[model samples]
Target: SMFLPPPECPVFEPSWEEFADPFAFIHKIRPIAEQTGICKVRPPPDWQPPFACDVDKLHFTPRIQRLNELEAQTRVKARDYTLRTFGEMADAFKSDYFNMPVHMVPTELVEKEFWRLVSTIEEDVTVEYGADIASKEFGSGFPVRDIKLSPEEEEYLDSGWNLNNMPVMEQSVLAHITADICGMKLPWLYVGMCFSSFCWHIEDHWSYSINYLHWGEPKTWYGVPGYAAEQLENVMKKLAPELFVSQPDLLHQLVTIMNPNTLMTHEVPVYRTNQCAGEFVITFPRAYHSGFNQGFNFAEAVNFCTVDWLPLGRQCVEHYRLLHRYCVFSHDEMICKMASKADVLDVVVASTVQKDMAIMIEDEKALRETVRKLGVIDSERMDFELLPDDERQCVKCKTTCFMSAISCSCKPGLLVCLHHVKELCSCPPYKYKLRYRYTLDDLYPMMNALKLRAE
Candidate 1:
């Protein structure tokens, strides 16, 4: 009666042939999985990628988490713990709290009280969790060492599905981004104890994410399908209006957890699943998800942008502009980078980027005209990509300005995208110079290169 787990999301059991190419398999299942928002994939019996890491040697800083629902929390730039010691603490805490062996505690009861204690006024439960990019101190959960291995282990190294290798794959557009968006590109290893939770949030640029449980007790998850994302956000905003309010920067906003029942009561569709060791969960673009650990466990996840994600990547940056949120990377910059390397890009990716680039050019052309009408006649070819991202962001909208920006000598280092020409200070339009990475003439040729490669 305390908590009703949401309906189970879709799960796929792919045969070896169907599972050979992870990207193709993702595309094949898109129609069904996208509707559900998140889906579990069960690899064939023999498809296990060995996990290797020394619990004692691998260490990380753990962030203390307050087990409160929808709390406004900021992302700390930095955390420390060895895997074994953390697990001992986690196991002891769980067993002591429940007055039973750690594994003996029913997952359902944990789900129930997890919601109760987080939402109620009297209890303030604080737990710690570890999340970080795979590094020299703590390595990827998937086997990555160049040790002598069996044919089976060697096959996984060359596999596309390996989370460690997914970002730089030829098929992923994120492969072209030169910016250090490590959070989006690198695999993050997560160490969780009882009630250590992830809040509801979508992937950066609305790209897809895949998470694998290397070894652990089952981790519970709740998902809202992509279509219901807005509906779900509206529900969350009603109770936690503070989070929905504008923030000084992207890092200052809060992502939060709420009981699935609360969302269900609001008539928002929700789905639930518990991912165990050896299982993979894929979240589609704009799908909102959150969950807590049942007990001590370890998992690894990575974000990826597929050819299917190209258009949505553009849309996401536009959405961020409206919300006055910071962008992880400029979509236009990545598109141009791929265009410059079009001949070497995957043909399908080239085709997709060409279509998105066509739209980008038309939008940029119009934006340039609007700024021109505002008397911004002075122009210079500023190499925006070479500028540090924070330095080039539109001062008003906080967009990572890539294609074009409005600037003035009066305000030396600040800039605004063409859309914000009026906001770049009280300086006269004549005093404002248009800073652009590429002219319309320069852009047309780049699009042509993409089209030629795609053809």
Candidate 2:
């Protein structure tokens, strides 16, 4: 079964008009959790099972519940250190630790640091490291497992820790997410996504990732949208070298290096190459682009984003004019509509709650056409007639109608209702918080493993 959060029981729901922008919705959720210091992320509308008014109770394994605790701590810390003032946000990028301005760190040291950080993490979270296609399988009904690394694999992730190394928990999530999902045993977890230095050449995982730059100057090319997929592939296979030029605009030009992996292609621009500290480069899904840290010593940052394989744009487009002027492309552009036909369907399913939507053709023509049509459907609500009234029963409460993922009464261990946005869940509070498992016994295990080291 797909690993997902439990559904919420129906409870007092708010008006639908209350929700508007996506980011605003996310921000609104914060106050509730912040106020009570014990809020929950219930199920959303899409998670609901069709025809079932109530969903099965979301049963959280002891481990899953523990995430709430860690989330609470992290959320609070982030809030306290929230980017309240421009000074704080500016300081984030300005910090010596952020820019890792120096590019001459030994590669070996960088590798070591990576390993040390990864090793420090226990299996509190599982990662999806295989190909990207398989990643959805877990949620869509794939299994999870562990990822094994070899000694040679130890070459890059070993000695790279330093004050300048601005690593964040997001890195751990990716690595561990990959490790957990693709850990050797699970075939479904290992999809065929490529990993390249330029314009992230892989359909392996979430394409829309927020990479917090730790240290290093990386170059990226944002591809044009609605253009032909061939343009991205041709750009990557052809002008990748030219795309990586070192200069002021190299960064600007980096946004358009479309690798020939998925749908939609554009050769946006090589915007800026330098990522100041604390700045996040938000990459959108299906947007053709590629990048590389300019140097090895680049610092790290957290990435809190997901990929939905849809042509979704963000409100920040105007703020990031580069994306608006350079990234956006219209029909009658370079890409032929007939070519992208197949991809259009998959794009639609991703944008909506359509069942079993997937891409089939390999040609750019089919892919482009598919994306274009589906993009239209995504804007409309499908099967609205089937949807319940505003006061839908809470999946958890099974009483009042449901509202949002945060407002549901979710508990683990029960037959989830069908109407709830998702399955009901009941989790113990203590189980979800973060706690180090260190104790006398833990020390003993370490001591026993070490026969004799110079004290």
Candidate 3:
């Protein structure tokens, strides 16, 4: 055996009643799933949403991928292929490559070959897979069509578990507090072919992600828990230092594949699973995940945030600041926006956000005091969210600035977050202006509104 499979992750078979509240189910499984980094859910058989789309009409270009272990690859965007054509090509490729009926090939054989080949220096394996946001050109495989449809199709168009609708659901922090992370918040449609692989990486902002195998052969996955994420990284860095280069821009967010055996030998724990049609796989926050398709398949995936994610979201932004990496959105801004909409907010969300807000306000108060001590005296209640995200980011650390930032007339529009006060233009401290969105007084009331709603 080239590589032994890791222990299987937890799998949940939720009853219809339990599945009715997806967020509730996610929270229930959190304790168990987070330990292994991922879990699979088997929905009630009666809950199947009819998948529909004309094979000839729906089409997408496939991104080519090289399967060498530890080699970095960009998600380059692709030749147009109709669904019918792609599946035909995928099946033919798999059948011909292995010289057997695709399904007749054993899963273990494929797994062995996968690990063996990726680690080998002689073979160069490249495959194609589709990765794209659900667009009008070709929407997610879910029931999103507006034209006439059968009753089963119509019934599922707005299903709560529908990947497209999951992001904006009630318990998700990324929901109505939408800040134009359209690419992240929306569902993604993946067209997976045999041996087409996804490299090891976590979701941006440490958010949770889910994938539904609408229809497919088994898709194998490997996962490392959040606690072992850095351990896995250390192992990767020892082998491929190029991937660890500081990624200053979003495009530089690197990705690569490596054998789970490599991590195991380095003492990092890993888990594995085979997600089949009608099942779902959920990757917990900060979980490092990679996988390959068993054969021709289609899946839909989406990123989500829960009330449980609030504190972690704050921690993620701080980590980004320390790493000097750009952030997708300001955590503080999202918390305040949710506070503003407290009246309509879910009580669980209201309560959780209120706690995070209290922590935030105290942190803000301290930062403001520190800046004031440094002689940043001038102040204005500028609406931070009014500016585009890039315009509002701290120039030095690239944090999406919201609560407060230091600006100097000498530099025109340049700003530094409270943490990076010294990194701003070298004008005298007295010349700096602390641009603020709300006074300490105003902030308390906003959080109080959430407390009231929570109670």
All candidates' lDDT scores? 0.88, 0.25, 0.88
Candidate 3 at residue 373, lDDT? 95
Q: What is candidate 3's lDDT per residue for 329-444, written digit by digit as tens?
A: 88999999999998999888899999999999999999999989998888888899988887877887798899999998888878899999998887889998889999999999
- Say which prediction, candidate 2 or candidate 3, comes out ahead on lDDT: 3
TM-score of each: 0.96, 0.24, 0.97
Q: Pairing residues by index, what is the TM-score of model 3?
A: 0.97
> Taking the tens digit of each residue's C-alpha lDDT, what string does model 1 give over 143-194?
6646687776677887777887888888777878888888789899899999
Segments in model 3 whose C-alpha atoms lie over 4 Å from true places: 75-78
Off-target runs (Cα >4 Å) in candidate 1 are 77-79, 145-152
Tell me how candidate 1 scores on lDDT.
0.88
Give all candidate RMSDs, comma-separated.
1.6, 27.9, 1.4
lDDT (Cα) of model 2:
0.25
What's the best-to-worst order under lDDT?
3, 1, 2
Q: How many pairs of residues collide in model 3? A: 0
